């Protein structure tokens, strides 16, 4: 396959990147510099992963190796919740700029298009439990994004986990400057996400599939939920491709003309990972996996649902 697509800011975006949620600080550091020794060229990170020094460690070290440079280089963090204030978002991003080592970034998202109260806590709980929002909206947070923009500090802006009229929201925002470039939404066989994908993608934007492998290490896994990699049906499809589950699993948004950001910290399946520009899932295989769904969500979180904008109340 081609390995980049064409963004609605005229830059283009690998298609393959490396998730780090989750990844220690201890292996991310390795993990990152040897997924850029393998040939990954895009890097998803966030401020509240908690670990953006270290990925930047491994990404400047490359830089000064020769190995990459950095226009070759797509590097895509995210705006946390508790700094939807206009005042507090050139800060957030040049934060994760110090972090990363960098002097820009490819791609900065809107991690979620709900608002919390600033401060040191990154999910500020009021007694009873309930995440205490901030009064800030989308569109006024949208502005500031595109203010980083025309202050050379990203290349492009994006939003991420906004359903279908919120993405609509910011299309139609008054005096709206820069469209998004991406919307990126938890995507897989169990959470196929037709809907959502189809409104975005007649709109120019382009989706990235996050947590394609259904997140196993996910902190909140329960021993019965639903497993993609061991799925025997998926697995039949790999098998028939000669090719691992996890390599299906990454295959399939690819050929759904989606970005695809799978994590790992282990070198040998962040290698095996990227080993899919070589085989082709049939539509048959393509409408066999997206007939699995379930409507199945990894990321979602109970003391954040009473937020107004809390984005899975809607259908999509
Ligand atoms: N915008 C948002 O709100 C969100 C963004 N994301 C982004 O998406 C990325 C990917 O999603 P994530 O939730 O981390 O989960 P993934 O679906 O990418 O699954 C990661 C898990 O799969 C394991 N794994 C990776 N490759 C293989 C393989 N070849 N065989 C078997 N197991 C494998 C990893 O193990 P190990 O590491 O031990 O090898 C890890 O336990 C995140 O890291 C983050 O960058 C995710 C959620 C939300
Ligand atoms: O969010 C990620 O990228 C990956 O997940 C996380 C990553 C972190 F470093 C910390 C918390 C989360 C959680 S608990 N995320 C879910 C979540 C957060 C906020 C809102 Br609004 C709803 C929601 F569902």
């Known amino acids: 396959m081609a390995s980049r697509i064409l963004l609605n800011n005229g830059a283009k975006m690998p298609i393959l990147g490396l998730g780090t949620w989750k990844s220690p600080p201890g292996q991310v550091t390795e993990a990152v510099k040897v997924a850029i020794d393998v040939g990954y060229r895009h890097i998803d990170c966030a401020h509240v992963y908690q670990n953006e020094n270290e990925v930047g460690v491994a990404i400047q070290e490359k830089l000064r190796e020769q190995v990459v440079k950095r226009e070759e280089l797509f590097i895509v963090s995210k705006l946390w919740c508790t700094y939807h204030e206009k005042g507090l978002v050139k800060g957030a991003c040049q934060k994760t700029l110090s972090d990363l080592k960098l002097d820009y970034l490819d791609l900065y998202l809107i991690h979620w298009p709900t608002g919390f109260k600033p401060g040191k806590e990154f999910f500020p709980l009021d007694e009873s439990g309930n995440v205490v929002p901030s009064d800030t909206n989308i569109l006024d947070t949208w502005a500031a994004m595109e203010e980083l923009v025309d202050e050379g500090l990203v290349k492009a802006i994006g939003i991420s986990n906004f359903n279908h009229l919120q993405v609509e929201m910011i299309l139609n925002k008054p005096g709206l400057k820069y469209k998004p470039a991406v919307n990126q939404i938890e995507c897989h066989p169990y959470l196929t996400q037709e809907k959502l994908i189809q409104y975005c993608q007649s709109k120019g934007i382009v989706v990235t599939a996050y947590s394609p492998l259904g997140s196993p290490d996910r902190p909140w896994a329960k021993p019965?939920?639903?497993?993609?990699?061991?799925?025997?049906?998926?697995?039949?499809?790999?098998?028939?491709?000669?090719?691992?589950?996890?390599?299906?699993?990454?295959?399939?948004?690819?050929?759904?003309?989606?970005?695809?950001?799978?994590?790992?910290?282990?070198?040998?399946?962040?290698?095996?990972?990227?080993?899919?520009?070589?085989?082709?899932?049939?539509?048959?295989?393509?409408?066999?996996?997206?007939?699995?769904?379930?409507?199945?969500?990894?990321?979602?979180?109970?003391?954040?649902?009473?937020?107004?904008?809390?984005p899975f109340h809607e259908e999509f």
Do not use: G
């Not at 939920?225 to 098998?239: M, N, Q, T």
């Not at 090719?243 to 050929?255: D, E, G």
């Not at 520009?277 to 048959?284: A, K, P, R, Y």
């Open 224 to 310: 019965e939920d639903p497993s993609l990699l061991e799925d025997p049906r998926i697995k039949a499809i790999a098998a028939k491709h000669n090719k691992t589950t996890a390599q299906v699993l990454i295959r399939f948004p690819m050929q759904r003309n989606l970005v695809v950001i799978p994590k790992s910290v282990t070198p040998e399946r962040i290698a095996e990972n990227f080993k899919v520009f070589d085989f082709e899932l049939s539509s048959q295989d393509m409408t066999t996996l997206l007939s699995y769904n379930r409507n199945w969500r990894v990321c979602a979180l109970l003391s954040c649902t009473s937020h107004k904008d809390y």
